[PDB]
């Protein structure tokens, strides 16, 4: 089985770990022991082919920088998560990607933007802004929610597709 290391990036309150625990543990984060494994693992079939979906979540409310590059340098694809109610996350998506390029030493690398907390109600940045954000990079966009487990699998699965090419 192919091993895919996906580095999940997010602002802070967006809910990066939540999407991971939901896809991997089918549960909501914010109640697990951190630094236990450092990365998540999962076996699924995307695009009709069986591959290993290793979800690697990153820090959100810790201004992680030193380790931030570590995940990228060892990770293949990068899943960006933003909050519809937290416009602050919208600006985070671009600045974060810039960090991926420096470490990845490339331009077009496996990446996927996912609008977390979309099932809430208060969406500051309409889908137009989110969709246009991903288009600016040339990556697919998928709206999902770490609270309803809607699209969580899609967003994560989509990321693998880009990595498979690498």
Ligand X SMILES: Nc1nc2c(ncn2[C@@H]2O[C@H](COP(=O)(O)OP(=O)(O)NP(=O)(O)O)[C@@H](O)[C@H]2O)c(=O)[nH]1
Ligand Y SMILES: O=C(NC[C@H]1CCCO1)c1cc2ccccc2cc1O
89 binds Mg ion (CB under 5 A): no
For ligand X, the binding residue among 5, 7, 8, 15 (CB under 6 A) is: 15
Site for Mg ion in 17-76 (CB under 5 A): 17
Three-state SS at 149: coil
Encoded one letter per residue, x for contact with ligand Y by CB under 6 A and - for no contact, window 2-41 reads: ------------------------------------xx--
Sign of CA pseudo-dihedral 88, 114, 35, 2: negative
117 binds ligand X (CB under 6 A): yes
Instruction: Output the smallest distance, CB 81 to ligand X, in A.
Output: 9
**Residues 6 or more apart in contact with residue 7 via CB below 8 angstroms:** 56, 58, 71, 72, 75, 76, 77, 78, 79, 100
Is residue 91 within 8 A of residue 82, CB to CB? The reply is no
99 binds ligand Y (CB under 6 A): no
């Amino acid at each position: 089985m192919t091993e895919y290391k996906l580095v999940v990036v997010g602002a802070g309150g967006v809910g990066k770990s939540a999407l991971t625990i939901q896809l991997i543990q089918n549960h909501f984060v914010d109640e697990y022991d951190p630094s236990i494994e450092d990365s998540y693992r999962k076996q699924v079939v995307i695009d009709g082919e069986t591959c290993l979906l290793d979800i690697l979540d990153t820090a959100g409310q810790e201004e992680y920088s030193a380790m931030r590059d570590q995940y990228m340098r060892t990770g293949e694809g990068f899943l960006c998560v933003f909050a519809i109610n937290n416009t602050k996350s919208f600006e985070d998506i671009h600045q974060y990607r810039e960090q991926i390029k420096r470490v990845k030493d490339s331009d077009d690398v496996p990446m996927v933007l996912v609008g977390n907390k979309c099932d809430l109600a208060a969406r500051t940045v309409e889908s137009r802004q989110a969709q246009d954000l991903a288009r600016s990079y040339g990556i697919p966009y998928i709206e999902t929610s770490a609270k309803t487990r809607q699209g969580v699998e899609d967003a994560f699965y989509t990321l693998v597709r880009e990595i498979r090419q690498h």
